[PDB]
Curated annotation (Swiss-Prot), chains A, B:
Residue(s) carrying (Microbial infection) ADP-ribosylthreonine: 66
Part of the whole protein covered: 1 to 76 of 229
Record PTM text: Phosphorylated at Ser-65 by PINK1 during mitophagy. Phosphorylated ubiquitin specifically binds and activates parkin (PRKN), triggering mitophagy. Phosphorylation does not affect E1-mediated E2 charging of ubiquitin but affects discharging of E2 enzymes to form polyubiquitin chains. It also affects deubiquitination by deubiquitinase enzymes such as USP30. Mono-ADP-ribosylated at the C-terminus by PARP9, a component of the PPAR9-DTX3L complex. ADP-ribosylation requires processing by E1 and E2 enzymes and prevents ubiquitin conjugation to substrates such as histones.
Protein name: Ubiquitin
Effect after changing residue 48 to R: No effect on HLTF-mediated polyubiquitination of PCNA
Domain Ubiquitin-like: 1-76
Recorded name of the encoding gene: UBB
Localization, UniProt: Cytoplasm; Nucleus; Mitochondrion outer membrane
Site feature location: Interacts with activating enzyme: 54, 72
Glycyl lysine isopeptide (Gly-Lys) (interchain with K-? in acceptor proteins) cross-link, chain position(s): 76
UniProt site positions, description: Essential for function: 68
Length: 76, 76
């Protein structure tokens, strides 16, 4: 299925995912598509910071849901 | 698995480790990779000075955890 990911510049990308994808899977797909290291990605859905071991379905992410991607440097 | 090690200059390295590695193993790997004598290394995780005979798992060090490396000369 397709989901959308929205950045702070307004840009929106489409990703191919399954409900069983974990957040780490999604970050890996953003790496593949956009070249962003997973450690520089912060994903948000429904006002929650998304955790690497939980699935899209755990957060109620569905076909055509929109996540937010914020880039950060590693805190250290 | 991979862990990160952060220095006081801000530099971060990646190391290949196992949960069963001891701290002495980790210092040996920093020697191999970066040429720092073990006696010049101080490792910190979770606000604890790490001791050469304990394992990564003993300190709750996990995949993608970040340790801190401080260089010191030998006290004597």
């Amino acid at each position: 299925m397709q989901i959308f990911v929205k950045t702070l510049t307004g840009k929106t990308i489409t990703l191919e995912v399954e409900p069983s994808d974990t957040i780490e899977n999604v970050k890996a797909k953003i790496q593949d598509k956009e070249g962003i290291p997973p450690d520089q990605q912060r994903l948000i859905f429904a006002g929650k910071q998304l955790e690497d071991g939980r699935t899209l379905s755990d957060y109620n992410i569905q076909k055509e849901s929109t996540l937010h991607l914020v880039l950060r440097l590693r805190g250290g």
